[PDB]
């Protein structure tokens, strides 16, 4: 909108457009570079560890269910 | 991709890593407690075997 | 008339590939038997995976990476969910990229995360309910927010998938039907989990509200005069399609809940139906071993075919990310369809 302003000059506004463009490129590139590497690595590692821990918890629950079934086995023994 | 979507997915990945760490710690504590109880029970079984 | 030419080209000499599964090579070896079945077949949301379960007990899953299944890996697995029990329904969990829910007409719902590097399908978790309860259908809210499990009678369960599948609520079917010995035949979710559409056998159709995790009966309309077979929704979200066994296929307006368009050339029962991801073409598989392709906007027949007594029970499904459709073949063998130079109708 500053282009069609009464007193403004074109060259300064073109410079401001160049500066805005560079700022946009820089911010987008910084956020992308930060988001890709570290976030991907940490997410993958945490996901693997969480899956392993959930498998261990399911194994413990299966052992508890095995004890519950051994209760019925001993009951059948009588 | 666009900067807004970039910031959005970055925040989403951060929150996901945080929640994953929290849930992993919780599940690890639960599995540790259950495995401790199971080992306390199975000590006698191992001694007998 | 562009769509008619497109469908004709999709039924041509080329532009077709046989999905090479175990049954396919079996028939190739024994032909160059009693066909078991295809219990169910359901895509992933992102259109890059497929899963289905025969009657033998083995469920195949493909990781689509090619058109004619050239480089598509295949994780074959033996009779999962027990050796005696076979799978009947599965949902693909739109939340993540690998999880799967499977039900086997028993009191146990199995959550398995399929891996693609190896061929190992590792059981991640099992969910259990009352001992007598025999659920056989599972569903996922298209946003991955709720899970639904239904019995043939007197049980409906809703779990909150976010909070580690904590049992959120349940409901007795006799409270929904209020008729003489009704058996839920088909369920479906609304676009964005807000309402559940249920089709009983006596003919009724019910709309339940599932907003904040508490089921409730919103309304019940006497839609059909026979059991309702399938219930599908339009992807744009303006009308929902109901197909019955009495030979009728209606499309109901979503905002007002009143019949708007009727398919009248039909003279037989409907076994399944599906509508493309663009909400433009409607495929009906009737009971006389014949398929039809109608136009959603106008309601006039635009293509017919004939199964010709090959694989009596057919299946149809339209890709969720392209205008291609998997259709059964001769002896329980799947048959892809494409044009190989048109990803979507618009490009045509």
The residues with which C100 forms a beta bridge, in sequence order, are: C112
CB contact under 8 Å between C113 and A58, yes or no, is no
Give the Cβ contact number of residue C64 at 10 Å. 20
Q: Which residue has the tokens 């892809």?
A: C336
Residue A7 C-alpha, separation from nearest chain C C-alpha, in angstroms: 49
Question: In C261-322, where does DSSP find H-type helix?
Answer: none
Contact flag A39-B10 (C-beta cutoff 8 Å): yes
Closest Cα partner for C276 from C231, C227, C233, C314? C233
Q: How far is CA A42 from the centre of its chain?
A: 9
Can you list the positions of beta strands (E) in C117-227? 121-128, 135-140, 146-151, 156-160, 166-171, 186-189, 195-199, 205-209, 216-221
Residue C146 burial by Cβ neighbours in a 10 Å radius (0-12, 13-18, 19+): buried
- Per DSSP, B16 falls in state H
A4 CB-near residues (< 8 Å, 6+ apart): none
Sheet holding C316-318, edge to edge: C316-318, C325-328, C334-335
Q: Chain A closest CA to C139's CA: distance in Å?
A: 23
Order of strands, sheet of C108-114, starting from the edge strand that comes earlier in the sequence: C89-91, C99-103, C108-114, C121-128
Establish how many alpha carbons lie within 13 A of residue C205's alpha carbon, considering only the half-sphere containing its beta carbon.
Answer: 25
| Secondary structure (3-state) at C280 | coil
With contacts defined as CB-CB under 8 Å, which chain A residues touch B31?
A: 53, 56-57, 59-60
Q: For residue C78, what are its two tokens?
A: 């033996």
Q: Resolution in angstroms, to 1 decimal, for this deposition?
A: 3.4
Q: In whole angstroms, give the CA distance from residue C83 to residue C78.
A: 9
Radius of gyration of chain C (CA): 20
Cα(C154)–Cα(C182) distance, integer angstroms? 10
A 10 A CB-CB count for C138 gives: 25
Three-state DSSP state, C202? coil
Instruction: Give yes or no for B8 touching A (CB within 8 A).
Output: no
Q: Note whether C110 and C104 are within 8 A (CB).
A: yes
The strand pairing partners of C301, in sequence order, are C294
Question: Rounded to 5 degrees, what are φ and ψ at A22?
Answer: -65, -40
Element (H, E) at C224: none
Q: Which residue has the tokens 């083995």?
A: C58
Which whole-number Å values give the CA distances from A41 to A49, B17, C216, in the listed order? 12, 10, 44
Q: Would you call B35 an interface residue with chain A, using a CB distance cutoff of 8 Å? A: yes
Among candidate residues C241, C243, C277, the one with its CA nearest the CA of residue C260: C241
For chain A, the C-alpha Rg in angstroms (whole number) is 32
Phi/psi for A38 (5° steps) reads -65, -45
In angstroms, the CA B15 to CA C90 distance is 29
Cross-chain Cβ contact A51/C125 below 8 Å: no
Residue C241 · residue C250 · CB < 8 Å: yes
Residue of C nearest to A58 (CA): C125
Q: A58 and C125: CB-CB below 8 Å?
A: yes
- What does R_g of chain B's alpha carbons equal in angstroms? 21
Task: State the Cα–Cα distance between residues A34 and B9, nearest whole angstrom.
Answer: 11
Q: Is C273:C315 a contact under the CB 8 Å cutoff?
A: no
CB contacts < 8 A, A to B, total 61
Cβ neighbours of A42 in B, within 8 Å:
17
Alpha-carbon distance of C314 to C271, in angstroms, equals 8
Contact C92, C76 (CB under 8 A): no
CA distance B32 to C11: 59
Sign of CA pseudo-dihedral C53, C57, C58, C59 = positive
Query: Quick check: helix, strand or coil at residue C153?
Result: coil
| Strand order through the sheet with C301-304 | C270-275, C281-286, C291-295, C301-304
* H-helix or E-strand spanning residue C134: none
Q: What chain C residue is nearest to A56 in terms of C-alpha separation?
A: C124
Which experiment gave this structure? cryo-EM
Using CA atoms, how far apart are residues C42 and C177, in angstroms rounded to an integer? 28
Burial class (CB within 10 angstroms; exposed 0-12, middle 13-18, buried 19+) of C184: buried
The set of residues, in sequence order, having a beta carbon less than 8 Å from that of A22 and lying 6+ positions away, is none
Number of other CB atoms surrounding residue A35 within 10 Å: 20
In this structure, the number of other CB atoms found within 10 A of the CB of residue C223 comes to 19
CB neighbours (10 Å) of residue C233? 19
Cβ contact C125–A54 (<8 Å) = yes
Q: How would you list the strands of the sheet with C166-171, edge to edge?
A: C135-140, C146-151, C156-160, C166-171
At C226, list the tokens: 């026979």
CA distance C3 to C6: 5
C129 and chain A: CB distance < 8 Å anywhere? no
Q: Is-contact C147 C127, C-beta < 8 A?
A: no
As a whole number of angstroms, the distance between CA C302 and CA C280 comes to 12
**Backbone φ/ψ region at C81: left (φ over 0), alpha (ψ -120 to 50), beta:** left
Q: Which chains touch C (3 or more CB pairs under 8 A)?
A: A
Beta strands C146-151 and C291-295 are: unpaired
B2-28: b or e for each residue (b if 16 or more CB lie within 10 Å)?
eeeebeebbeebeebbeebeeebeebb
CB atoms < 10 A from the CB of C133, how many?
A: 15
User: Residue A7 is encoded by which pair of tokens?
Assistant: 């007193």
Structure tokens at C94: 């739109």
Sign of CA dihedral B4, B5, B10, B14: positive
Q: Strands (DSSP E) along A1-78, which ranges?
A: none
| Whether the Cβ atoms of residue C207 and residue C195 lie closer than 8 Å to each other | yes
């Amino acid at each position: 909108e500053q282009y069609c302003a009464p007193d403004t000059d074109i060259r300064g506004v073109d410079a401001q457009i160049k500066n805005y463009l560079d700022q946009i490129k820089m911010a987008r590139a910084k956020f992308g570079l930060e988001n890709k590497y570290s976030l991907k690595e940490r997410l993958s590692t945490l996901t693997k560890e969480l899956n392993h821990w959930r498998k261990e918890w399911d194994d413990i629950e299966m052992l508890m269910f095995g004890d519950d079934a051994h209760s019925m086995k001993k009951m059948i023994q009588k | 991709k666009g900067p807004k979507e970039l910031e959005s997915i970055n925040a989403s990945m951060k929150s996901d890593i945080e929640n994953v760490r929290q849930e992993v710690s919780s599940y690890k504590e639960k599995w540790l407690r259950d495995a401790e109880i199971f080992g306390k029970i199975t000590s006698i079984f191992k001694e007998e075997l | 008339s562009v769509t008619s030419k497109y469908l004709q080209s999709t039924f041509s000499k080329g532009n077709t590939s046989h999905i090479e599964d175990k049954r396919f090579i079996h028939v190739s070896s024994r032909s160059h038997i009693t066909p078991n079945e295809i219990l169910s077949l359901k895509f992933h949301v992102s259109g890059s995976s497929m899963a289905y379960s025969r009657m033998d007990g083995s469920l195949t899953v493909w990781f689509i990476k090619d058109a004619s299944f050239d480089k598509s890996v295949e994780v074959y697995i033996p009779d999962c969910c027990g050796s005696d029990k076979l799978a009947t329904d599965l949902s693909w969990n739109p939340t993540s990229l690998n999880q799967i829910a499977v039900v086997s007409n028993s009191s146990e719902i199995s959550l398995l995360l399929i891996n693609e590097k190896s061929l190992t399908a590792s059981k991640l978790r099992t969910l259990s309910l009352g001992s007598k309860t025999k659920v056989n259908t599972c569903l996922y809210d298209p946003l991955g927010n709720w899970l639904l499990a239904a019995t043939k009678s007197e049980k409906i369960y809703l779990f909150d998938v976010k909070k580690d599948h904590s049992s959120v609520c349940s409901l007795n079917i006799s409270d929904i039907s209020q008729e003489d010995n009704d058996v839920v035949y088909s369920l479906a979710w609304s676009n964005g989990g807000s309402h559940i559409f249920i089709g009983f056998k006596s003919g009724y159709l019910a709309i339940l509200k599932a907003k904040h995790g508490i089921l409730e009966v919103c309304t019940k309309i006497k839609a059909h005069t026979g059991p309702i077979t399938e219930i599908k929704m339009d992807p744009w979200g303006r009308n929902f399609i109901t197909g019955s066994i009495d030979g009728n296929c209606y499309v109901w307006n979503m905002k007002s809940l009143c019949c708007e368009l009727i398919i009248n050339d039909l003279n037989s029962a409907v076994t399944t139906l599906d509508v493309c991801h663009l909400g433009k073409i409607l495929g009906i598989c009737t009971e006389d071993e014949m398929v039809y392709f109608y136009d959603l906007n106008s309601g006039n027949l635009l293509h017919s075919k004939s199964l010709a007594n090959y694989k009596t029970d057919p299946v149809l499904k339209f890709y969720p990310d392209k205008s291609w459709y998997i259709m059964s073949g001769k002896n329980d063998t799947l048959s892809n369809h494409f044009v190989k130079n048109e990803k979507n109708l618009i490009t045509y």
